[PDB]
Design an enzyme around this catalytic site. Structure first.
Site, PDB file in Angstrom:
ATOM      1  N   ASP A  64      80.367  14.609  36.179  1.00 28.98           N
ATOM      2  CA  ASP A  64      81.189  14.472  35.462  1.00 28.98           C
ATOM      3  C   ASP A  64      81.976  12.966  35.041  1.00 28.98           C
ATOM      4  OD1 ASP A  64      80.294  17.189  35.007  1.00 28.98           O
ATOM      5  OD2 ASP A  64      81.641  18.109  36.205  1.00 28.98           O
TER       6      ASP A  64
ATOM      7  N   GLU B  16      79.447  21.276  25.933  1.00 31.26           N
ATOM      8  CA  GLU B  16      80.343  20.928  26.781  1.00 31.26           C
ATOM      9  C   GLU B  16      80.980  19.562  26.311  1.00 31.26           C
ATOM     10  OE1 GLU B  16      78.668  22.488  30.433  1.00 31.26           O
ATOM     11  OE2 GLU B  16      77.422  21.246  30.768  1.00 31.26           O
TER      12      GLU B  16
END
Ligand SMILES: O[C@@H]1[C@@H](O)[C@H](O)OC[C@H]1O
Ligand SMILES: [Ca+2]
Length: 329
Positions: free
Chosen positions: A24, A222
């Protein structure tokens, strides 16, 4: 697990670090250097508990691990699952934005403040009011404003919200209903509060129609990220079950954004998550995959590859194992 071996051989990026699992990646240029704020996968499911900050002092530099800067035990409102974080700077302070889960099972986004980009960060005692779901990204607009983008469906719980209010019977739209988009709110000058309730960010197709819920090739799943280039705003994001980072453009940080194409082809491991950051002479895509861990979805490592905007503003697709590779998904 030999088809995996072909991909490792032709990977275009090596893992930026290998002594811990990272995911991430949120990249920023703060104070003349490149700081990366990734999540920290633990080798025991996504039960991450802390954040490190990484740094490249200059282009091509070896990647430094500046250590742990925040742990969930110092986040009083949160119980677990310290997921995809981001950072911003204002007034000489550095703010670490992070999604985490309360004891009652709901994700919200909290923030932690430090006096340096490497922290340490002191977490606010309550989460940011008006936030929910996951995957914050904070855009530092050229004009001096900061915008918080967030959201993720499925595990991210965004599907349980409409107009910023939770309902247990709120579900992901289906069929011809518009797919949910990420949320956006201008931040207050004090950076730890929203300046306004969040709004839906609308992603449109080529005909100016909002993407449908049944369009899993393109609809938002997302990890939103926004960057500025050549007078436009680029929204990029994961599509989840089709394993792509896609992007769309708008002349406003609020959108609506018009779908453009695929920015990153599928990576090894189920998730895909990214950021896009300019460092001196080069734009880079930061992303992750599960090659290092042997294909384990929950044990990831971050990577970077140079990214190019063409003259017409489009971004050519990046193929993490070569255009020739057999896609992992
Ligand atoms: O925030 C990330 C989320 O987008 C993904 O679903 O799983 C890992 C998390 O860190
Ligand atoms: Ca992110």
């Amino acid at each position: 697990a030999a088809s995996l071996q072909a991909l490792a051989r032709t990977a275009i990026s090596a893992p930026l670090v290998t002594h811990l699992y990272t995911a991430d990646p949120s990249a920023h240029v703060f104070d003349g250097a490149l700081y990366i704020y990734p999540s920290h996968d633990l080798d025991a499911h996504f039960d991450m508990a802390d954040y490190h900050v990484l740094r490249m002092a200059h282009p091509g530099a070896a990647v430094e691990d500046l250590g742990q800067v925040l742990h969930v035990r110092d986040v009083p409102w949160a119980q677990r699952q310290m997921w995809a974080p981001d950072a911003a700077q204002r007034n000489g302070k550095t703010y670490l934005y992070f999604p985490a889960k309360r004891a009652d099972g709901m994700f919200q986004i909290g923030v932690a403040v430090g006096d340096r980009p490497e922290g340490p960060f002191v977490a606010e005692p309550q989460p940011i009011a008006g936030t929910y779901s996951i995957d914050p990204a904070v855009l530092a607009d050229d004009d001096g404003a900061h915008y918080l983008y967030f959201g993720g469906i499925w595990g991210g719980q965004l599907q349980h919200y409409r107009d910023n209010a939770y309902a247990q019977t709120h579900q992901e739209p289906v069929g011809d209903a518009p797919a949910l988009g990420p949320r956006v709110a201008r931040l207050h000058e004090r950076m730890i509060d929203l300046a306004e309730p969040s709004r839906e960010v609308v992603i449109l197709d080529e005909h100016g129609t909002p993407l449908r819920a049944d369009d899993h090739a393109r609809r938002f799943f997302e990890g939103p990220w926004v960057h500025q280039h050549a007078g436009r705003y680029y929204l990029s994001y994961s599509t989840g079950d089709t394993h792509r980072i896609c992007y769309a453009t708008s002349d406003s940080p609020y959108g609506p954004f018009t779908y453009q194409g695929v920015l990153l082809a599928p990576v090894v491991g189920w998730t895909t998550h990214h950021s896009i950051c300019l460092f001196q002479q080069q734009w880079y895509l930061f992303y992750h995959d599960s090659v290092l861990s042997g294909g384990q979805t929950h044990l990831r490592s971050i990577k970077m590859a140079p990214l190019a905007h063409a003259a017409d503003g489009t971004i050519a697709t990046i193929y993490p194992y070569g255009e020739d590779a057999v896609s992992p998904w």
